[PDB]
């Protein structure tokens, strides 16, 4: 009960700047194509802004995601147990130990 309650907790931060991220940077990109579109730069470097900026972006999303989620299992993982159950992760090992 409790425990997982604090799971969804950590999930909090997970999704919080899990947003402030791709929101943040995707926004940034939005700034690059933004001002970049005030004089007359051809559509190409604008595509570039958009797309490398994407890299920063989905990059970001992932960054949250990925991690965050993996995390979710290492929980799950946790959520479940049984003597004899292997230990190979290490990091987690503690992480849920500790």
Written account of the structure:
- This is part of a larger assembly, with one chain.
- This protein is an all-alpha fold.
- It has helices at 2-36, 43-79, 91-96.
- The longest helix is centred in the middle third of the chain and has 37 residues, at 43-79.
- The radius of gyration is 20 Å and the shape is elongated.
- The PDB classes it as transcription/antibiotic.
Roughly how many Å is the radius of gyration? Answer: 20 Å
Give the overall form: elongated
**First-residue to last-residue Cα separation:** 19 Å
Binned, the helix content reads: over 70%
How are helices and strands ordered from N to C? HHH
How is the main sheet built?
A: none
Number of strands: 0
Strand content: under 5%
Structural class: mainly alpha
Task: Give me the number of helical elements.
Answer: 3
Protein name: DNA-directed RNA polymerase subunit beta'
Coiled coil: 19-74
Subunit structure: The RNAP catalytic core consists of 2 alpha, 1 beta, 1 beta' and 1 omega subunit. When a sigma factor is associated with the core the holoenzyme is formed, which can initiate transcription.
Family: Belongs to the RNA polymerase beta' chain family.
Descriptive key words:
mainly alpha; DNA-directed RNA polymerase subunit beta'; part of a larger assembly; 1 chains; elongated; 98 residues; 3 helices
Question: In summary, what is this structure?
Answer:
Helices cover 80% and strands 0% of the residues. The radius of gyration is 20 Å and the shape is elongated. This is DNA-directed RNA polymerase subunit beta'.
């Amino acid at each position: 009960s409790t425990l997982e309650a604090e799971m969804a907790v950590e999930r909090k931060a997970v999704e919080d700047q899990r947003d402030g991220e791709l929101e943040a940077r995707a926004q940034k990109l939005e700034a690059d194509l933004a001002e970049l579109e005030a004089e007359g730069a051809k559509a190409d470097a604008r595509r570039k802004v958009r797309d490398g900026g994407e890299r920063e972006m989905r990059q970001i999303r992932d960054r949250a995601q990925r991690e965050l989620d993996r995390l979710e299992d290492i929980w799950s993982t946790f959520t479940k147990l049984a003597p004899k159950q292997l230990i190979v992760d290490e990091n987690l090992y503690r992480e849920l130990v500790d």
